Design a protein around this ligand. Sequence first.
Ligand SMILES: CC(C)CN(C[C@@H](O)[C@H](Cc1ccccc1)NC(=O)O[C@H]1CO[C@H]2OCC(F)(F)[C@H]21)S(=O)(=O)c1ccc(N)cc1
Ligand SMILES: [Cl-]
Ligand SMILES: [Cl-]
Ligand SMILES: [Cl-]
Ligand code: NA
Lengths: 99, 99
Amino acid sequence: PQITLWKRPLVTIKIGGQLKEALLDTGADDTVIEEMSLPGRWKPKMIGGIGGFIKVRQYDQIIIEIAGHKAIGTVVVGPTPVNIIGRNLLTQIGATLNF
Amino acid sequence: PQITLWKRPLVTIKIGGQLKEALLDTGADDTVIEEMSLPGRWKPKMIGGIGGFIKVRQYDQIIIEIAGHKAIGTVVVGPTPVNIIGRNLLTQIGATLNF
Ligand SMILES: CC(C)CN(C[C@@H](O)[C@H](Cc1ccccc1)NC(=O)O[C@H]1CO[C@H]2OCC(F)(F)[C@H]21)S(=O)(=O)c1ccc(N)cc1
Ligand SMILES: [Cl-]
Ligand SMILES: [Cl-]
Ligand SMILES: [Cl-]
Ligand code: NA
């Protein structure tokens, strides 16, 4: 679709068997999801933000369906105030900024 | 243009006659710029993200050029890790997300 930016660009995603609301975020390098369990190995990481950092768990090779489009990549999980789809998965669904 | 997301969507902006680098950020409601001098009165605002909130100074009706496109609107100043162009000015330059 073509999504204008008058309001937050929120979409439904499916991750880990669960439906969630997430923000399509070109300013995020990484995809960051609120606390949930995911299968497989993980390792700790810190991610930056406007106000400082949060600790997350990094899971690799996770599949997410983003507004009907499947993508695979790294997902980090931790106390984010909003679920964020970042560039590592926006590239895979062919998302671009246009003006 | 059509901007892909394999790298950060950094562009040049011009504010107060000065060129700066800024990130096009669909996950930002607000345009947030690093400490600088702007004209006029400001109003208080809080903006919140990963790692908590920062206190910002809100300046309205500021002239700013973004990747060659003229905008006039609200810019808030505070200790942000990078200059961020948020949806209030992305909508003025006509930007959409497409996939
Ligand atoms: C700051 C930016 C360079 C990086 N961020 C992504 C942003 O899009 C973030 C994404 C974000 C959205 C919502 C809550 C938390 C984070 N938005 C944001 O901080 O916006 C602030 C300015 O406008 C306000 O509107 C949303 C806000 F946050 F409130 C304020 S982020 O969330 O800190 C982030 C940083 C590193 C990774 N890997 C992933 C995400
Ligand atoms: Cl990835
Ligand atoms: Cl591409
Ligand atoms: Cl505005
Ligand atoms: Na894995």
